[PDB]
Structures are given as C-alpha cells and as structure tokens.
C-alpha cells in the first residue's frame, strides 16, 4: 500500500508517456536488431531488401 495513493497515482500518470515511449524505443530496436519479418514486411522502404 506504499505505492497506492493519489500522489503516486498522478506520478505514475506523468510517467506513462515516458515509459510508453521507452517501450516503443525498445520494440523498434528489437525489430531492427533481429530483422523481424512480421513487422519489417509492412514499412515501405525496408520491404525492398527482403525481395
């Protein structure tokens, strides 16, 4: 119950956009590093190299 309260709720609300953007950063980095087909066969340019 230490993390359950109004101040902690609104701090979490401020930190949702940053954590979501960091999750997007991690997801995009994972696709780029692994060359994931299931995502990379939908963007326009990167479709060219897989033929």
């Amino acid at each position: 119950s230490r993390f359950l309260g109004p101040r902690y709720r609104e701090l979490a609300r401020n930190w949702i956009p940053t954590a979501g953007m960091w999750g997007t950063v991690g997801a995009v980095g994972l696709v780029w590093a692994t060359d994931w087909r299931l995502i990379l066969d939908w963007v326009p340019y990167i479709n060219g190299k897989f033929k």
Binding site: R2, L4, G5, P6, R7, Y8
Partner: protein, 102 residues
C-alpha cells in the same frame, strides 16, 4: 481457554531455545531500520544489558553450549522492553507514509 493457550505458549517458549542462551524476544528480534531506531532510542542501561546478553549468547553458541537450567530466563520474566519504542517508531513511519501518500 486462556490457561491452555498460556501453557502451550510456555511449551513453545521452551521449544524455541533462546531462553537457554539467556536471550529475550526483543533481543532476538531481527534488526531492520525500525528496530535499529528502537535500539538507538533505548536508554543506556537497557542498551548495555541487551548488548551483553547478545555477546553472551554469541559466546555460548561459539562453545556450542547453553546456560545452566537455573540461569535460563523464564517466560514470566521475559521483559518486553523494546515493544513501546518499536510501536512508536512504527507509528511515526506510518504517519510519514500517510503524509507522503496524501
């Protein structure tokens, strides 16, 4: 009834084993932050008594022995000396947590 519960508590007190080393329940409480605050809030004589009892318990455990049965502390004489200090420290910490939450 309460008499059977007191007797079974006496049997558990014998079975626990810290009475054989001359210790107390507040002596064998694990030192967290609140417990350390309670020990620092203890007076001088109780601090010295607690540290000597801990030292004697460590010496007895080193020698793998216990006190004589005459010198075992009794369940009726187990003083709850750290209980008010610990309760006050917990109350202050809960007040701080409530103020931080609100």
């Amino acid at each position: 009834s309460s008499k059977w519960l007191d007797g079974f508590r006496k049997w558990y007190y014998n079975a626990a084993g810290f009475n054989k080393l001359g210790l107390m329940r507040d002596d064998t409480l694990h030192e967290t932050e609140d417990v350390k605050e309670a020990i620092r809030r203890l007076p001088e004589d109780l601090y010295n008594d607690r540290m000597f009892r801990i030292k004697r318990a460590l010496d007895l455990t080193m020698r793998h022995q216990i006190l004589p049965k005459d010198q075992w502390t009794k369940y009726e004489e187990d003083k709850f000396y750290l209980e008010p200090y610990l309760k006050e420290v917990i109350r202050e910490r809960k007040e701080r947590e409530e103020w931080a939450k609100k």
